């Protein structure tokens, strides 16, 4: 929150805080209409900007905010994790029920798309990748990987049953291991950041 003087340069009007700078901007206790953030403190400063008409005193005040994750957890991170688990539970069904596991995979993909659509409408339209975007991308990758693994198992059926059985038992445990590793690394790098 930068304020200064319009029309009065530094040689005419200077600003200063009336009390100690740490005690001049005072936020009330019940003065918080924040729903998504958390006010941590304030920070004032004073400086000079050089414009086309002269030097002007500018008083700066920074309010430090931290976004609360409780909404986005229940909104995006819990449905995505539950949807990937719903994709990974397909590995326990028998290889003789092909419409069952196909409908699992494809409806899980539908669920991931509607989740990504509902979750993309929350964030403003930035032109880069956020952490939630990376999470949704990796979860979509895991879901798609589950469906392609099912396709490999189904395609390898009726020609080599042992290879299909081996890769479905190995991929029945490799998917939760990799998803847990991704979760550990992601939450560690974005909670200690």
């Amino acid at each position, epitope marked *: 929150l930068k304020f200064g003087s319009y029309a009065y340069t530094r040689a005419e009007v200077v600003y*200063e805080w009336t009390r100690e*700078p740490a*005690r001049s901007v005072v936020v009330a206790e019940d003065g918080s209409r924040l729903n998504q953030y958390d006010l941590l403190g304030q920070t004032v400063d004073s400086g000079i900007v050089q414009s086309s008409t002269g030097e002007y005193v500018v008083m700066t005040t920074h309010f430090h905010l931290k976004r609360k994750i409780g909404y986005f957890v229940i909104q995006t991170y819990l449905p995505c994790i539950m949807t990937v688990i719903l994709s990974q539970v397909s590995f326990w069904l028998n290889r003789e029920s092909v419409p069952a596991r196909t409908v699992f995979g494809v409806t899980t993909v539908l669920t991931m798309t509607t989740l990504s659509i509902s979750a993309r409408n929350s964030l403003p339209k930035v032109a880069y990748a956020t952490a939630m975007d990376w999470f949704i991308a990796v979860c979509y990758a895991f879901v798609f990987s589950a469906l392609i693994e099912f396709a490999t198992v189904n395609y390898f059926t009726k020609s080599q049953p042992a290879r299909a059985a081996k890769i479905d038992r190995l991929s029945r445990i490799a998917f939760p291991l990799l998803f847990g590793i991704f979760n550990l690394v992601y939450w560690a790098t974005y909670l200690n950041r």
Partner: antibody
């Protein structure tokens, strides 16, 4: 413009002293007035400040209860009274006023309190 | 209580050479760090008010450099009257000064 302090004092440990700082060249109701202490061959220590236009005072946690700062506007004077002085606060006591970017631009002349027998 | 640590506590230096003094704050002090000069048995004189602003009557050889926590005071062509103490003090909160730095001649 100018701050004038009193002369040195030689008091006995356990009594009270009152130091004065008289301002010449400005009205003390426009700025804050600071009291600083400096021991021989050491760094400065902020005692407290007073807002003479209001009367609000703030003190250093290592001086709360010991020192008390008052002001008299009619003669442009700031007073510092120390209550119970022990055998270590033999320092120089400076009187300062706030400046442009909350600095102490004008200082006094120093008042050397001394406790002995 | 924001603590200002000044370094070094004592230094020696010759005539006509650049010198840099440093002041580090524990908490945030925006640009409200001031540099005072104190000769023995005299009152301190304000040299640099705020981070990088010279006071009226200070030569153009003193210059300050500011940040959120790290502050420096640089003297250029150092003359023979700078045999004094230099204190850094913060004014973001209730004022606290540094320990002091004694410039010497050798």
């Amino acid at each position: 413009v100018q701050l004038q302090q009193s002369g040195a004092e030689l008091v006995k440990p356990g009594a009270s002293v009152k130091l004065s700082c008289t301002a010449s060249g400005f009205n003390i109701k426009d700025t804050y007035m600071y009291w600083v202490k400096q021991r021989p061959e050491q760094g400065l220590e902020w005692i407290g400040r007073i807002d003479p236009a209001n009367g609000d005072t703030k003190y250093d946690p290592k001086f709360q209860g010991k020192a008390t700062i008052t002001t008299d506007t009619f003669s442009n004077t700031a007073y510092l009274q120390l209550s119970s002085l022990t055998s270590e606060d033999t320092a120089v006591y400076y009187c300062a006023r706030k400046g442009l970017r909350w600095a102490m631009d004008y200082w006094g002349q120093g008042t050397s309190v001394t406790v002995s027998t | 209580n924001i603590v200002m640590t000044q370094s070094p506590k004592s230094m020696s230096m010759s005539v006509g050479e650049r010198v840099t003094l440093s002041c580090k704050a524990s908490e945030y002090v925006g640009t409200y760090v001031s540099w005072y000069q104190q000769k023995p048995e005299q009152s301190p004189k304000l040299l640099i008010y705020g981070a990088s602003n010279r006071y009226t009557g200070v030569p153009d050889r003193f210059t300050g450099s500011g940040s959120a926590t790290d502050f420096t005071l640089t003297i250029g062509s150092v003359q023979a009257e700078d045999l004094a103490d230099y204190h850094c003090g913060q004014s973001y909160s209730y004022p606290t000064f540094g320990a002091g730095t004694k410039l010497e001649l050798k």
